[PDB]
Amino acid sequence: LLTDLVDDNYFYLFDLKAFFTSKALNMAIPGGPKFEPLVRDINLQDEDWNEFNDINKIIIRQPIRTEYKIAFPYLYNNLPHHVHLTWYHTPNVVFIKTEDPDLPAFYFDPLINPISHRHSVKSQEPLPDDDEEFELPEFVEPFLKDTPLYTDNTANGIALLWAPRPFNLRSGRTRRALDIPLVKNWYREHCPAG
Amino acid sequence: MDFLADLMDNSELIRNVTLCGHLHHGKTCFVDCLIEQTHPEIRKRYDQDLCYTDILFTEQERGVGIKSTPVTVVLPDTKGKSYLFNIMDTPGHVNFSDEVTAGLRISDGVVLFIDAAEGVMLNTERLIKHAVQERLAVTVCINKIDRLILELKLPPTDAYYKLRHIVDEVNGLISMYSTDENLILSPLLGNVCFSSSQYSICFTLGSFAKIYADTFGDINYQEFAKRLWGDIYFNPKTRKFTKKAPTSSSQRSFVEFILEPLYKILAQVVGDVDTSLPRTLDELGIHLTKEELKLNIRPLLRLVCKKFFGEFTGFVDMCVQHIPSPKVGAKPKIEHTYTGGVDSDLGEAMSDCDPDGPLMCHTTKMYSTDDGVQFHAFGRVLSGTIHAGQPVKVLGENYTLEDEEDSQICTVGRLWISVARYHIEVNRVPAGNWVLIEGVDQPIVKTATITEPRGNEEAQIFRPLKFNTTSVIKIAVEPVNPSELPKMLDGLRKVNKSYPSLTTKVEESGEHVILGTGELYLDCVMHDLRKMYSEIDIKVADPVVTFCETVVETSSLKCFAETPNKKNKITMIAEPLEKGLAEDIENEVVQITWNRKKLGEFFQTKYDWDLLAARSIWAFGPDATGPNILVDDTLPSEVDKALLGSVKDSIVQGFQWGTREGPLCDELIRNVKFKILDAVVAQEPLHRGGGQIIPTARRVVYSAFLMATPRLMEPYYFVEVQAPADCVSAVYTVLARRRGHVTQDAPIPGSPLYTIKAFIPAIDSFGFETDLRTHTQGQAFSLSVFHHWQIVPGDPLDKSIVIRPLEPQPAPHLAREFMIKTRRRKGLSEDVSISK
Amino acid sequence: VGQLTGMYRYKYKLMRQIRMCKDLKHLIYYRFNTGPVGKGPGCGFWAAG
Amino acid sequence: PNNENIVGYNNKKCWPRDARMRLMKHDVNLGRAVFWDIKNRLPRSVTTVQWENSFVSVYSKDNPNLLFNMCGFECRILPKCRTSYEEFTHKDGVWNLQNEVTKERTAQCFLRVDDESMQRFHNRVRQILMASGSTTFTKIVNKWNTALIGLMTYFREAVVNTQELLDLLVKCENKIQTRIKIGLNSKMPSRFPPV
Amino acid sequence: VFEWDASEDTSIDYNPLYKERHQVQLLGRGFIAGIDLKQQKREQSRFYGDLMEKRRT
Amino acid sequence: PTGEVLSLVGKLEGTRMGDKAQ
Amino acid sequence: RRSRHCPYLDTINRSVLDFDFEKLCSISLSHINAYACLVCGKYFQGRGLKSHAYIHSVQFSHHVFLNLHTLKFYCLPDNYEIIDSSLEDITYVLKPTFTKQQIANLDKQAKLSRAYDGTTYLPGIVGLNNIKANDYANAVLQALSNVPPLRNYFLEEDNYKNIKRPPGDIMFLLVQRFGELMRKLWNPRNFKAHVSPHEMLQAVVLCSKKTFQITKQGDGVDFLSWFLNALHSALGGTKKKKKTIVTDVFQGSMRIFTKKLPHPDLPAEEKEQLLHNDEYQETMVESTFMYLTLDLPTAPLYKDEKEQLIIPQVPLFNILAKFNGITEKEYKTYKENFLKRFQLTKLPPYLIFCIKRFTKNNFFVEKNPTIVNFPITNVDLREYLSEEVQAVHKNTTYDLIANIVHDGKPSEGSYRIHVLHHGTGKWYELQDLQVTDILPQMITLSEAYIQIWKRR
RNA sequence: ACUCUGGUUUCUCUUCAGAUCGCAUAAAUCUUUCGCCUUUUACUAAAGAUUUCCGUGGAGAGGAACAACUCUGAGUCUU
Ligand SMILES: O=P(O)(O)O[C@H]1[C@@H](OP(=O)(O)O)[C@@H](OP(=O)(O)O)[C@@H](OP(=O)(O)O)[C@@H](OP(=O)(O)O)[C@H]1OP(=O)(O)O
């Protein structure tokens, strides 16, 4: 029942802000819904051929689409009254959840590109000569040596980090069964092709 | 609180540093963590970020930094000394690079935030290059370390490999730009610092070694840290640090003592809160209450890391040890920034950063209050102390020791120190600080030098703020109601003050064009204009880029012009300049301030030019650093030299004006070499005046340029896109649609994401970000920066072509269209008149 | 509900619900009946309506 | 100085953007100048000419269409020399203007029913319908027929290009039919026949 | 009207880029809600599967 | 067969006005 | 050092110089170092190499420029200063500096000032250019410019300068621009016969928070009251001075006898006992008034029986019957009626009357057309002062100095203004660019709106 | 390593609700544009204004639970 989406970058121009912008600008995202105009402006919809918007002066290389105007509400459209600025690009949350349980929680999955550590320049940095003066007390140890690196719950918890809203809370409050739209995120995504 | 003001008296316990990095690399989050550490009453919400240091509505709504924000704050050091820090929270977006530079000019040091998972990316490379240009101290902070644990789950050995690869790449990039090898970066040196700003992790090798010491005692954290990175291994049999692994499957010291505890402390909080967390929490001395253990994973992890790592002393001691104080670091700042130089008496006075010396402040920032009708200056005090309610003498960008017109006497009212949103008012500010100044908005335009009147009359200005990128996007702006045109005009002034690289220019036809770097830059500019400054409805034309004008062939015949007196006749020829030479002049590789021997040696040696021709070079193009050359070529056997030198200057201004406004595209002649092949100078001074020669020089330059077959240079943006592997093919097609050619596609090491670097025409780059983001469903993100002017396909002087309206013309037509419509946007004639 | 009851005849604003519910059906069936399961009257995901 | 002459410039909104007058600054200024010159000749007391109740349309290099309005006809002239890719004939709202010397199709005349005429016709139908509480059906039908023949004979060739007029005509005819049907029975027929 | 008119459709695009939206692989391990996992596995382009098998040692 | 009058916009453009009249 | 030898003084043409414009560069829109090209009158960036002035000089071959902020002339293509006495007229047009003797002599000045174009005019009475149908502001400013003490206070820049102002204060911009505009009005050497108040209108819009807009035709009374209060507030130190110039010119002291009225639908005994309850008793309140609001009596609303359709006419004394104990005024407040009767205490040296027109009725706003009949020569106000305060006062005779009239309906009206010239005694009526001499006989034959009177 | 610390649940009541009262979502009335139009009653779809309804949090008050020590912490808590 849960869309396996890690971050909200999927809803770039397909979120609440973009839909509010589309409703305000009397236009619609292709996948988005069609609204009635926020204000009629029937006579003001088609202004006269001025010398400012002279189509002769306008250089055309790629058409200015509805998505352009919605993404930049104050740049590609005129009189943006009651318009909402969409959230810009969030960091790409690349999180590879484990697939086979018989695998360490920390593991270089083949999806990650190999570093392939090069040594064209021999890594040289100022560090004193080997094993000559410094000797730690025997009682000084790494902070967590008795604790194992990862239990069987570590991978599950890491997966639970990047999970939808109900499934990323240790605790929470109780909501009525009425107030739980099980397919709200189903139609909030783009319609599948075909 | 009073200690905050008193600490400004000491010029060594202050550090002027700017936080710069790529887009969304935790800079704002880092400043929020610092604020929370120093402000008990300021705490971020569990799910929503603090969003501190971002006060603009656009900053919060868009989520991208817009305006660099000043943060003054007192932080204890690792040893326990309370230093004073001033931080430029700068936008990471490349389109706001100018906003970095305004904070970069008045900053002693640079903290470069790099995301651990993302990599270096483009704005980081540009930032380190540009900071090398100002020769600032460089420190690197690999932020978002948790993304190597909680996102990629890389093994700690691979995590060390990734961190070392990033550090080596940064060091190599710096070595490719900075000659001084002292800028090597390593965590053991105190340069590289590790951090995850979401969970309030901020440690260097010294900080973690000090944590070890406080855990155990009698440990030299400095010498321990000096052995906590690289191919060094640890032996518990001898408790000894070696350069070889004591066993076969041993781990490196950095992994063994630093990465491993961090991995386990994160894993026990993300996976075993109810089972194993209390044991490891009591083991490390962290005592969390029953209520505190009931928080979600992220707030609990932030809380435990705050309790464990404590203060952010790693960042503090990094800045103290590697970023010079204003008192000691003023000398390179004066050497590179001030026009008069350190040699002059004022240079010596301001190099010492004397609080009792002559008053001198350098304002490079303008901030708009709630009303927006009275801007507030913001700048560095480089000498003396400015006082509240005091008369000052403000200089301008064009001010020289001769021209006193650019100055103005203004009374400075109450002044304060800006701590992000809240600023503390202070009666005075000593040297080396960053100060908000009131009452000087009217004479200050962008860069400003403020000095005291009735003294130090031989005071010059600092060099104008130089920006990395060339703003090429241009949008015409008009008022919906012309009866309300003045208001919009007023608003224009405000934005011209607010945005350092914004250029508002009124063309001949009356179109108020605005120059912006990119789509988001102009979007924010016009949002501010509509909603904050003008408060009236505005109209935007369709975006278009500027164009440059060049030649590709030698002028067929020498073109001559004559003064209205018909006694001075100047005959010139037109040729293109050599490859890279225009870039050399652009990057100030060679300057007109060079003596003739040095410039001649450069031209004759590197570019194989004639020695006499190299000595025959007169001047540069549109500005002192213009990419066009004006070279004398009058043979001494026919033309007198001393007499020609009298009008040489006037011909120089004429040629500069001609290159400024090109005959073809009305502006910006680029990459053109002009040789004066004949000079007939009237023997009397009154027949060779500037008002007579300069128009003649413009006419002869135009004739020479137009006789040679001209070409239009459109700006090509260098766009790199970081995207998953499956989206690379789609990005290829999207770039192919907009006439862009792909250069490189390199998978990012230590991450499953490719990075594709390509060149796309700026005129075809509009909406490219949105197109790519929506076409790949948000997986492919792009940033655009100006790279280089390139010849547009087509011939601008082929009149057999017909321009079909409202249709994308093919490439062979483009140039013609690109000029003809441009002329219509200027109100100019339909075709270029060769006779004129 | 519209076919079984026809209560929209006495309050036409109620059609707003019906047009929604049918939509939810089209939202569910083409997710429900995607793979080897063919089109048929087998869905029982009645929470939305 | 502020180029305010374009604000108060009446334009024939009934035409598309390209067909409508292009408000170039030079042409707007010229139209204002022509109107001011004409207004100067007439004394302000013997008569008056007000700008807002006027239309000045200039054909020049920028403007390819001459727009005018007379006798309830909104007409637009497009010379064939510049912007006439096809001199078609099927469109019956087109007057193939012919020079008396060259005897060629130099210009194309597009006709339209004026908005004031449409408003007057709608008002006439409205007052026919609302003044029918106590009135025979034949009287109503005769009044509607008279109005319709007057409009169609006066504005022939101008209906075809005024799709709004076609919609208004069919709407008013449906109004008349609905009024008659309500007169017959106080309930709308479901499948009423046109016979 | 019980059903919805086809004219109400908003996803009408002349641009092939928007007509053909690049499906997200979700790192080859995520699955869109509702659709059975087997159908998506046999439907996904398996570019990530090919990359994994090439990098599987 | 509804009995309502339909608007002939976008209709019967294959016919002129002078047709069906002598 | 080749000054005093400029061969380009001939190219200067004073006709095309309009210095009323805001001093901003025609290209960069910058306020710093404004330079005007005397050939064309357009401002530029400033004197310097590769500047807008330099570009204009090398393009259009214009060789003479004037520094707006410096009042000094330069040549850009040759870049040298100009020191001539022939250019001083342009300097005075740009920056009219009035000496004390000439400021005093304006009252006794009786010479017809001649402009450059030849349209001889009078100082002070100079046509104001309407911009976007806001003649009310122009009429109010023209009326205010006729006051002698205000003219003395505002004519010289340093008279209202050298005071402390709040750092965030923008009201001082308006008060300092009023002086500039008014010394342009009183300048007897204008190039053009008229004065453009457009900069003043822009400053009014900037300081008024979008009210009194250039587009909208606001009420003259409200604009005058707001302007007077704003001018009083701006002047002085950081704390308001008790007696500013506006206070000593227009403000007077007046007394209100406010008596609460019981509900009229109450028993007589209950009304009497409420009156005895000390709540519905008379209370005396002193106050300061910038002007006196004159309430026009009710229109006849019916045709006169003998001579039908006669415009009502009221003597000035019936309106002046207010402000005394004998006459009350039952204010019909929506909550309860008030029995307020006024009484003048201390007359100002200059008196402002505002005849209340444009009264909003229960459904819309209508303009009362009742005309007031007054003796223009002089009026007596000693009879409208209480016996306690008549000992201090010695000059209660007032003569009409300025008259404002509104012509037309409230929706679209024209603000005309008659002003009395002190030097000649003539009345001049000016409406936008139009200026005409009007006989004092038919001054009262108009819908008087705002009257400015001098106690002499 | 100590003495006192005194529960939590649940049923109500009374006020305040700032905050996504609600990680959910209705209806009605009124006022503007509307679409149908022919009379109410249903309506078309956007904006604006209230209102009712299914819910919610906090505070305070009054019960029961029902026990009960303690939890916990003020500290000297000690080798
Ligand atoms: O659009 P609706 O009125 O909601 O009808 C739909 C639809 O029918 P139509 O779109 O043709 O009217 C399908 O039924 P089919 O007629 O296409 O079989 C659908 O099921 P599928 O999309 O899986 O075909 C479903 O049918 P059901 O709910 O019976 O599975 C339902 O039809 P009904 O509304 O007639 O039930």
Q: By the 8 A CB rule, do B137 and B323 touch? A: yes
Residues 6 or more apart whose CB falls under 8 angstroms from that of G89 comprise G14, G189
d(CA B343, CA B348): 7
Considering only CA atoms, which of B33, B27, B10, B32 is closest in space to residue B68?
B27
Say how many Å lie between the first and final Cα of chain B, rounded: 70
Per-residue DSSP letters for D53-107? T------SSS---EEEEETTEEEEEEEHHHH-S---SS-TTEEEE--TTT-S--E
Q: Label residue B262 exposed, middle or buried (CB < 10 Å: 0-12, 13-18, 19+).
A: buried
Amino acid at B24: H
Backbone angles phi, psi at B576, to 5 degrees: -75, 160
Residue partners of A167: CB distance under 8 A and separation at least 6: A2, A160
Q: How many residues does chain F have?
A: 22
Residue G117 has which token pair? 């174009």
| Structural element, H or E, at residue G232 | helix G220-234
Asked if B549 and B530 count as a contact pair (C-beta separation under 8 A), the reply is no
**For A10, nearest residue in chain E (alpha carbons):** E24
Helix (H, G, I), strand (E, B) or coil at G422: coil
Q: Which of these, D88, D90, D42, D82, lies nearest to D59 by C-alpha position?
A: D82
Of the candidates D115, G385, B5, B477, the one whose C-alpha atom is nearest the C-alpha of residue A43 is: D115
The DSSP output letter for B538 is E
* C13 CA – H50 C1', rounded, Å: 21
Q: What single DSSP character describes residue B709?
A: -
* Pairing between β-strand B82-89 and β-strand B14-21 as defined by DSSP bridges: parallel
Question: Which residues, listed in sequence order, are joined to residue B539 by a DSSP beta bridge?
Answer: B478
The CA distance from B660 to B628, in Å, is 10
Spatial distance between the Cα atoms of G87 and B346, rounded to a whole number of angstroms: 40
- How far, in Å, from the CA of C8 to the mean position of ligand 1? 20
For residues B476, B477, B481, B485, the Cα torsion angle rounded to the nearest 10 degrees is -110
Q: Do residues B784 and B766 lie in contact, with contact meaning Cβ atoms separated by under 8 Å? A: no
In angstroms, the CA D138 to CA D131 distance is: 14
Backbone angles phi, psi at B217, to 5 degrees: 110, 155
Give the phi and the psi of residue B743 in degrees, each rounded to 5: -100, -55
Burial profile B672-707: b = 16 or more Cβ within 10 angstroms, e = fewer? bbbbbbbbebbeeeebbbbbbbbbbbbbbbbbbbbb
Residue pair D21/D65 in contact by the 8 Å Cβ criterion: yes
Q: What is the dihedral of CA B522, B526, B527, B531, to 10 degrees?
A: 160
- Which whole-number Å values give the CA distances from G365 to B464, G217, G295, in the listed order? 60, 15, 15
Contact B789, B716 (CB under 8 A): yes
Phi and psi dihedrals of B479, rounded to 5?
-85, 145
3-state secondary structure of C21: helix
Q: Do B and D touch, counting CB pairs below 8 Å (3 needed)?
A: yes
CA dihedral over B646, B647, B652, B653, signed as positive or negative: positive
Q: Which residues of E touch A6 (CB under 8 A)?
A: 26, 30
Which distant-in-sequence residues (6+ apart) come within 8 Å of B138 by Cβ?
Answer: B109, B110, B112, B128, B131, B132, B174, B183, B185, B191
Q: What are phi and psi of B416, to 5 degrees?
A: -140, 170
What is chain B's percent helix, strand, coil content, to nearest 5? 35, 25, 40
Contact call for residues B349 and B35 (beta carbons, < 8 A): no
> Do residues A61 and B763 make contact, with C-beta atoms less than 8 angstroms apart?
yes
- D109 pairs with which residues across the strands? D77, D95
Q: What is the DSSP string of D111-135?
A: EEE-HHHHHHHHHHHHHHHHT-TT-
Strands ordered across the beta sheet of B617-620: B559-562, B569-576, B672-680, B629-632, B617-620
Length of chain B in terms of residues written: 836
Maximum Cα interatomic distance, chain A, rounded to a whole number of Å: 88
What ligand 1 atom has the least distance to the C-alpha of C29? 23
Question: In sequence order, what DSSP letters do the residues of G246-274 get, joined into one string?
Answer: HHHHH-EEEEEEEEE---SSS-HHHHHHH
How many C-alpha atoms does B601 have within 13 Å on its Cβ side? 5
What is the C-alpha to C-alpha distance for residues G204 and G127, in angstroms, rounded to an integer?
19
At B477, list the tokens: 């702006």
- Given the DSSP bridges, would you call strands B629-632 and B672-680 parallel, antiparallel or unpaired? parallel
Answer yes or no: are the C-beta atoms of B24 and B92 closer than 8 Å.
yes
Inform me whether the C-beta atom of residue E54 falls under 8 Å from chain C C-beta atoms.
Answer: no
Tokens of B122: 């483009």
Q: Name which of A1, A31, A114 is nearest E33 (Cβ-Cβ).
A: A1
Helix (H, G, I), strand (E, B) or coil at A91: coil
Q: Considering only CA atoms, which of G330, G311, G333 is closest in space to residue G322?
A: G330
Q: Is the CB of C15 under 7 A from strand H?
A: yes
Whether the CB of D179 is less than 7 Å away from nucleic strand H comes out as yes
DSSP at A193: P
For this PDB entry, the determination method is cryo-EM
**Cα–Cα dist B210/B212, whole Å:** 5
In the block, residue with structure tokens 């309300």: B484
DSSP-derived 3-state class of residue G343? strand
Please tell me what resolution, in angstroms, this structure has. Answer: 3.7
The span from the CA of B335 to the CA of B319, in Å, is 22
Could you give the angle at which helices B97-105 and B121-133 cross, rounded to 10 degrees?
30
Nearest to B687 by CA among B650, B724, B713, B654: B650
Encoded tokens for B631: 């070279």
> Cα G368 to chain center, whole Å?
23
Q: What is the 3-state secondary structure (H, E, C) of B436-476?
A: EECCCCCCCCCCEEEECCCCCCCCCCECCCCCCCCCCEEEE
Residues G104, G110, G114, G115: is their CA dihedral positive or negative?
A: positive
The number of beta carbons lying within 10 Å of the beta carbon of residue B642 is 6
Q: In what order do the strands lie in the sheet with D66-70?
A: D66-70, D73-79, D107-113, D94-97
Distance from CA of A27 to the nearest CA of C (A): 22
**From C26, C31, C37, mutation site for ligand 1 pocket: most ligand atoms within 8 A of C-beta:** C26
Q: Is the CB of E2 under 6 A from ligand 1?
A: yes
Tell me how far apart the alpha carbons of residues D131 and B137 are, in angstroms, rounded to a whole number. Answer: 91
Compute how many other C-beta atoms are within 10 angstroms of the C-beta atom of residue G44. 28
Amino acid identity, position B530: R
CB contact under 8 A, C31 and E4: no
The set of residues, in sequence order, having a beta carbon less than 8 Å from that of D148 and lying 6+ positions away, is D169
**How many angstroms separate the CA atoms of B60 and D21, rounded?**
45
E strand or H helix that includes residue G94: helix G88-94
Is there a contact between A182 and C47 if contact means CB atoms under 8 Å apart?
yes
Q: Which of B701, B708, B618 is nearest to B657 (CA)?
A: B701
Q: In terms of residues, how long is chain E?
A: 57
**Residues G14 and G36 sit within 8 Å (Cβ to Cβ):** no
**CA separation for the pair B174, B132 (Å, rounded):** 8
CA B541/CA A78 separation, integer angstroms: 9
Torsion of CA G404, G405, G409, G413, to 10 degrees: -60
**Residue burial B142-171, b: 16+ Cβ < 10 Å; e: rest:** bbbbbbbbbbbbbbbebbbbbbbbbbbbbb
Q: Which atom of ligand 1 is nearest to the CA of C3?
A: 34
Two structure tokens written together for B230: 């690289």
Strand-strand pairing, B376-383 and B360-367: antiparallel
Asked whether C22 lines ligand 1 (CB < 6 A), one says yes
Q: Which residues pair with B741 in a beta bridge?
A: B759
Q: Is B92 annotated as a binding residue?
A: yes
- Phi, psi at B22, each rounded to 5°: -70, 180
Which nucleotide does the CA of D178 lie closest to, via C1'? H38
Q: Which whole-number Å values give the CA distances from D135 to B612, D121, D131, D183, G310, in the listed order? A: 108, 20, 8, 10, 48
